[PDB]
Symmetry: D2
Subunit: 153 residues, 4 copies
């Protein structure tokens, strides 16, 4: 049978730092929901612990949060349209450089920033006419690194 | 700590044919369940239409199965230990070369092959001492191509 | 502290073929303009693809396959004009291994090949419309076991 | 007709910043010669503009240096061993964040850092028992980002 070469989407990143596990999530249908969980609080500071990406109840991934630290705040966001860019801050949290804040931008609106403001900035940008269709990265107790899969609209 | 570059696991594959969408699923925790959905019937010929990979608990992906055709049979595979090899057959279906049967092999037990085991064979093997920790590929109405992410135990 | 502006990696198509001892990858900054195919055996009979040499002016070059003792007896020099859009060929058994045996390169206008032993299992590397192939990767040892391409929009 | 899945090596990185062109160089034999091309002068400021990686014999690639700025100094690094880590500094040059200095480290020797050793540090390390067998990144007039391919020794 003819081996008709199968394709893999281009990538941007990862940014952030090395973690114990590589992770990757590129669903067939567009991402429409993101759930972010933190420890701490606004009064002090929100420590990003995990992020959950979903396309529906049958397509979900959770990165970070494998540690014992109790979560104190979670927020569920509905993503309208295609993500086109993300940015955020990276900084040390209990001995590890991790993603500390994140902001998503689609062709419809902005979401965030969610997390702590301080540290080194990062941002994922793609060429004109493209959309982000998945994410990948490294994680452990926290979200250490993140990058995106993108393709032409 | 140090600003260490993040890593991406090695890949094996993909095998099969190009498809409309690229898909990827590499969860932090070990893949422990796989649900294969087909059309047709066991006493006749099973037609793989979609596959669902999951990791305990809230990590799941469903690839293929975007078309109309109703599901008439499903095979639930509960994985024990680390998958180290997968194999199966590729053959034409309603005008498309797609994965038609698949088998998963761990360190001590085998699961399958499930589906219509006839056509062009394939198998994903990895270096010894490694384990498969995720899968990626192409899909549309069906599962067009498949490959694996692996890393050392 | 410097902004971490995520760097990109081109999309891929493939690889097709079979697993091999070494992974190889060659994606030069400039266009891929010359490809040299090296074979063993006499061409008035049957040529066995042993290695491929990809290059890009002025001096970017890579040679994959050909690590073994088989001598090269014939070479084919393909001077690519334009952007490569697709490649194809055949995979067959050679001395116990499933390897790339023939290969054809296709740009927008003309096409080069196929060269080698055009017999066995066909493969085809096609990219989306408006894109071009800008590099190759694969597995190889004594022979060229597998190959794939990197592509990006024109 | 057996489709025995072909593999692709694990990756570390890339680090730095997005660039106009993606580049990749992973030769069959190990790397043994690296040429760093700079602008300016050793006594003043050394500006890394391009890098030439080489694996004897004939396997060579040059990334960065596509710009008009003339080279005025080069550092030839002959490595006789397996590279296990690289590191360096990133900092601005003509309005762009680029790789400014770089150091290569094998199982038993260090080479560098060569270039303007100032700015934001980067470290690409790999799991123990592995070796870097290739490099990839983005570049234009300069070397914007770099990452490595690695595999078990």
């Amino acid at each position: 049978a003819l081996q008709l070469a199968a394709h893999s989407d281009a990538r941007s990143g990862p940014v952030g730092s090395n973690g114990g596990q590589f992770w990757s999530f590129r669903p067939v249908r567009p991402l429409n929901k993101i759930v972010l969980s933190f420890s701490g609080s606004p009064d002090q500071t929100l420590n990003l612990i995990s992020i959950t990406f979903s396309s529906n109840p049958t397509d979900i991934i959770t990165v970070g949060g494998v540690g014992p630290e109790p979560l104190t705040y979670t927020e569920t966001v509905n993503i309208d349209g295609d993500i086109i860019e993300i940015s955020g801050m990276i900084a040390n949290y209990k001995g590890y450089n991790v993603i500390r804040s994140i902001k998503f931008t689609t062709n419809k609106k902005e979401y965030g920033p969610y997390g702590a403001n301080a540290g080194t900035p990062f941002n994922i940008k793609i060429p004109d006419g493209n959309k982000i269709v998945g994410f990948f990265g490294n994680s452990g107790w926290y979200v250490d690194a993140i990058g995106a899969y993108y393709t032409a609209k």
